[PDB]
Amino acid sequence: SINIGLIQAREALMTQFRPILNQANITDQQWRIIRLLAENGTLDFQDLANQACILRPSLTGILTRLEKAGLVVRLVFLKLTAEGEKLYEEIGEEVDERYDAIEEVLGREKMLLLKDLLAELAKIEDAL
Amino acid sequence: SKHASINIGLIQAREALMTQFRPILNQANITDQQWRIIRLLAENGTLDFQDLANQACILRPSLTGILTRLEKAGLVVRLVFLKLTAEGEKLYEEIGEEVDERYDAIEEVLGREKMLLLKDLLAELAKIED
């Protein structure tokens, strides 16, 4: 029920977001990594894997491409490059415009509630 | 930036939920997608191929292959409509009982009422497909 509702909600969101990702030729997972490194200051490999919800064997390859593309750099801690910061703001702007279009219909109040409930649900491992 | 990520928020919520369900599904030879099909076939009784694909969010070629496996195991049968077998009904009730036990554990923490609201809000967010 909730499992399925989650996938149905994100899938409907993803179909309209996928054309955007192809214009920068970045994948979903790459975008999550890019955004997380921006919304956080810096993140190590394990923490990045946990928050991006990417398996450790998969994350290494993805990170390598982002560094070859000069978007992410290793120092083990990871952080966006100057260019990575710019890419995040441009794509993020389109997403905010997308967020605004949904909030205009769904309702600002319902939208805020959805954010809180999704955040609490993610946190329920430590709380169990 | 301005507003939080819905993309990331959605996937983080589900991963934490799947973490509580994977040990149950792995003790049986069931995958996430297979379980999704089994529940949908149970809540509707019977579903045709296209309708099943849309609700389980599984691509038609992939759905076909999974269905072939579920029939080899004698859990699903074609009639084009799909339905659980008698044993399929048994597996759903058996696995479902273990799954329900985890929902109760989560709801004790998240809140029984809030859990219900989240389903509604996700459906509304989902219906604004456009």
Numbering used by the authors:
A (entry chain D): 9 to 83, 92 to 144
B (entry chain C): 5 to 83, 92 to 142
From the primary publication:
NadR belongs to the MarR (Multiple Antibiotic Resistance Regulator) family, a group of ligand-responsive transcriptional regulators ubiquitous in bacteria and archaea. In the presence of 4-hydroxyphenylacetate (4-HPA), a catabolite present in human saliva both under physiological conditions and during bacterial infection, the binding of NadR to the nadA promoter is attenuated and nadA expression is induced. Each NadR monomer consists of six α-helices and two short β-strands, with helices α1, α5, and α6 forming the dimer interface.
However, it was eventually possible to crystallize apo-NadR, and the structure was determined at 2.7 Å resolution by MR methods using the NadR/4-HPA complex as the search model. Upon overall structural superposition, these dimers revealed a few minor differences in the α6 helix (a major component of the dimer interface) and the helices α4-α5 (the DNA binding region), and an rmsd of 1.55Å. In the apo-NadR crystals, the two homodimers were related by a rotation of ~90°; the observed association of the two dimers was presumably merely an effect of crystal packing, since the interface between the two homodimers is small (< 550 Å2 of buried surface area), and is not predicted to be physiologically relevant by the PISA software. Subsequently, analyses of the pockets in apo-NadR revealed that in the absence of ligand the long Arg43 side chain was always in the open ‘outward’ position compatible with binding to the 4-HPA carboxylate group. The ‘outward’ position of Arg43 generated an open apo-form pocket with volume approximately 380Å3. In summary, compared to ligand-stabilized holo-NadR, apo-NadR displayed an intrinsic flexibility focused in the DNA-binding region. In holo-NadR, the distance separating the two DNA-binding α4 helices was 32 Å, while in apo-NadR it was 29 Å for homodimer AB, and 34 Å for homodimer CD. Overall, these analyses suggest that the apo-NadR dimer has a pre-existing equilibrium that samples a variety of conformations, some of which are compatible with DNA binding.
